[PDB]
Amino acid sequence: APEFGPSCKHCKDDVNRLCRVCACHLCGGRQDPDKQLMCDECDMAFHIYCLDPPLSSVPSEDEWYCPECR
Numbered sequence: 001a002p003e004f005g006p007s008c009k010h011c012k013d014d015v016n017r018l019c020r021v022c023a024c025h026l027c028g029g030r031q032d033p034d035k036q037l038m039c040d041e042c043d044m045a046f047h048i049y050c051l052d053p054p055l056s057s058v059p060s061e062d063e064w065y066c067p068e069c070r
């Protein structure tokens with residue numbers, strides 16, 4: 001559809017497939033989008049429970065940098 005961006009280059013939006021590019025950058029899982037924190041710098045997303053130490057909730061502040069970018 002010319003009204004939508006093209007599929008993920010890496011997984012082609014196959015929901016049965018892990019993808020560390022468009023879903024959690026550590027586990028590649030798509031579940032819990034509500035719980036996926038996006039890096040202000042590289043735009044990769046991370047489940048709060050995949051981080052070390054894991055977070056039990058997302059921060060209230062908008063500015064967050066991932067393990068790779070810190």
Ligand SMILES: [Mg+2]
Pocket residue numbers: 038039040062063064
């Ligand atoms: Mg942010």
Ligand SMILES: [Zn+2]
Pocket residue numbers: 008009010011012013019020021022023
């Ligand atoms: Zn993908």
Ligand SMILES: [Zn+2]
Pocket residue numbers: 025068
């Ligand atoms: Zn990485």
Ligand SMILES: [Zn+2]
Pocket residue numbers: 024025026027028029046047050
């Ligand atoms: Zn994850």
Ligand SMILES: [Zn+2]
Pocket residue numbers: 039040041042043044065066067068069070
């Ligand atoms: Zn980052």
